[PDB]
């Protein structure tokens, strides 16, 4: 019922057919109950439903190393839209379907297992699109810039281990970080990559990265018009505006990177008062 | 001495300027003799009389009235060109500045075609794509934003090489803006000017694509 309600058989009225399927699934899904609880079958429906429609991902390695990806681009993309037309059947529905909305122990755990598959839900679409996103650059070229511990971690890592533990998304944030280095030496777009990143995968991406984003695209970007005389004092002030707005949020390997190439552009006494900026939105208090 | 180091320079230049006309010789380039100075100050006064010598860089009459020179349709039409061709070389920098730190980083590597170095400027200034463009991309890039700040770098031919990739899309512009680019003076011909502005009057007026309606 939840998927007929979803939309599943309609590749062969329609709209009547999947409100029946809704109320279906409503009226017959059961209920929690003491036996340490048993869920309803509607709770258990909805994860056997989400499991077949990653079984496919869950246990597969997400890359195969010239590296590329173990699972299709296209499987990708169908997996996703059915996860995601899921997720929205749930909340066009959020009012009406037991244990979504808040509710004595039962009807508890009930909306916490109901709460915990919603977040692997979106969790997995975020992870789907961070791997469409990494196979949209040039992989092996990040790949080959980039320490050993990171390429065996990347070699062996699950689509379970990205959707739901955190070094899965520790990795992420890591990739995300050298993606972009790379995107700035193709130099095509920073903001487009930027608000690619910002909204699709945000809870995985951070608004303090795409600004410090923005500054090293300033900085290699000035590296890059390093010849010209004119062009640098505003790709160099607005690459300094940009950093000392995240001070309070740098990490100590990005400020070096910073402060390295500032030296090449003689940009001394600027990379002077980003340093100290940065100290003091460390500790305000003093 | 009441004069600063710019005046000063520059009153050496004009005892040259008046050193040959003392002695007979060859009557020099006076904007030339002005922007010999320019370059030891800041860009701010190069980038003028680069201007200058661009706008009085026209075709004269020698021995001819001040008043009639510049009262003849004749002149004043060339003027408007030459500021164009100004404006649009002007701007052509700003585009360079912007993809690249600095003039001679961009130089260093090469000035990419018009084409390429217009795409690698529409990566900055728009990242996201704008919901109201319209007639489809090419190459990553809508094609309107291309045929703008190709004219307005003033390389109309990477401009048409734009419409040309994208013939199915832009409908009858493609016969329309072959003309501009060929016809003199940057007008198009009575009867299909006024096709083309009916056109865009009719119900163009107010399109979402503001590149569209700016071409």
């Known amino acids: 019922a939840l998927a007929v309600a979803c939309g599943q058989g309609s590749d062969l009225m329609d709209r009547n057919t999947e409100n029946l399927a809704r109320a279906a699934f409503i009226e017959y899904g059961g209920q929690p109950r003491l036996a340490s609880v048993r869920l309803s079958s509607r ?18 390695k997400v890359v195969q190393v010239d590296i590329s990806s173990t699972i299709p681009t296209s499987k990708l993309v169908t997996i996703q839209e ?20 808040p509710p004595d122990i039962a009807n508890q755990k009930e909306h916490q297992a109901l709460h915990a598959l919603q977040k692997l839900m979106e969790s997995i679409s ?35 281990q990205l959707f739901s533990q955190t070094p899965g998304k520790e990795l992420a944030k890591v990739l995300v970080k050298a993606i972009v280095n790379r995107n700035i030496a193709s130099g095509a777009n920073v903001e487009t990559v930027a608000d690619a990143l910002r909204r699709r995968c945000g809870s995985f991406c951070s608004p303090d990265d795409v600004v410090t984003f923005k500054a090293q ?50 940009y001394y006494a600027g990379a002077i008062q980003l340093c100290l900026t940065v100290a003091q939105q460390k500790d305000r208090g003093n | 001495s009441s ?20 002695n007979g010789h060859l009557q020099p380039n006076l904007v030339d003799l002005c922007a010999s100075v320019a370059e030891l100050d800041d860009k701010s006064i190069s980038d003028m009389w680069t201007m200058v010598k661009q706008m009085t860089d026209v075709l004269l009459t020698p021995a001819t009235d001040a008043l009639k020179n510049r009262s003849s349709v004749e002149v004043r039409m ?3 060109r030459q500021a164009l061709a100004y404006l649009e070389q002007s701007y052509k920098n700003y585009t360079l500045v912007t993809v690249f730190g600095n003039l001679h980083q961009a130089q260093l590597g090469g000035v990419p075609g018009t084409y390429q170095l217009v795409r690698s400027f529409l990566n900055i200034k728009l990242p996201a794509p704008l919901p109201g463009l319209q007639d489809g991309e090419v190459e990553g890039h809508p094609v309107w934003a291309l045929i703008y700040y190709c004219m307005r770098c003033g390389d109309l031919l990477a401009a048409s090489q734009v419409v040309n990739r994208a013939q199915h899309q832009l409908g009858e512009f493609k016969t329309w803006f072959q003309e501009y680019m060929n016809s003199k003076d940057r007008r198009l011909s009575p009867a299909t000017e006024n096709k083309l ?19």
């Open chain 1, 217 to 266: 695209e300033q900085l290699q970007r000035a590296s890059e018009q390093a010849h010209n005389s004119p062009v640098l004092r505003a790709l160099l002030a607005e690459s300094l505006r940009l950093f000392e707005q995240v001070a309070g949020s740098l990490t100590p390997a990005n400020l070096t990177t910073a402060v390295e190439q500032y030296i090449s552009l003689k």
């Open chain 2, 78 to 80: 060339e003027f408007v």
């Open chain 1, 43 to 60: 709770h258990d429906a909805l994860a056997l439903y989400l499991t077949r429609l990653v079984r496919t991902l869950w246990k597969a």
């Open chain 1, 82 to 101: 059915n996860v995601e037309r899921l997720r929205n059947f749930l909340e066009a529905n959020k009012s009406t379907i037991q244990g979504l909305a």
């Open chain 2, 197 to 215: 502005r009916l056109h865009y009057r009719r119900a163009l007026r107010n399109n979402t694509d503001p590149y569209k309606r700016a071409v």
């Open chain 2, 3 to 22: 004069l600063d180091n710019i005046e000063m320079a520059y009153a050496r230049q004009i005892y040259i300027y008046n050193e040959k006309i003392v």
């Open chain 1, 126 to 160: 975020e992870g789907i699109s961070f791997v469409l996103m990494l196979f949209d650059e040039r992989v092996s070229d990040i790949y080959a810039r980039l320490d050993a511990v990171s390429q065996q971690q990347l070699k062996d890592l699950t689509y379970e």
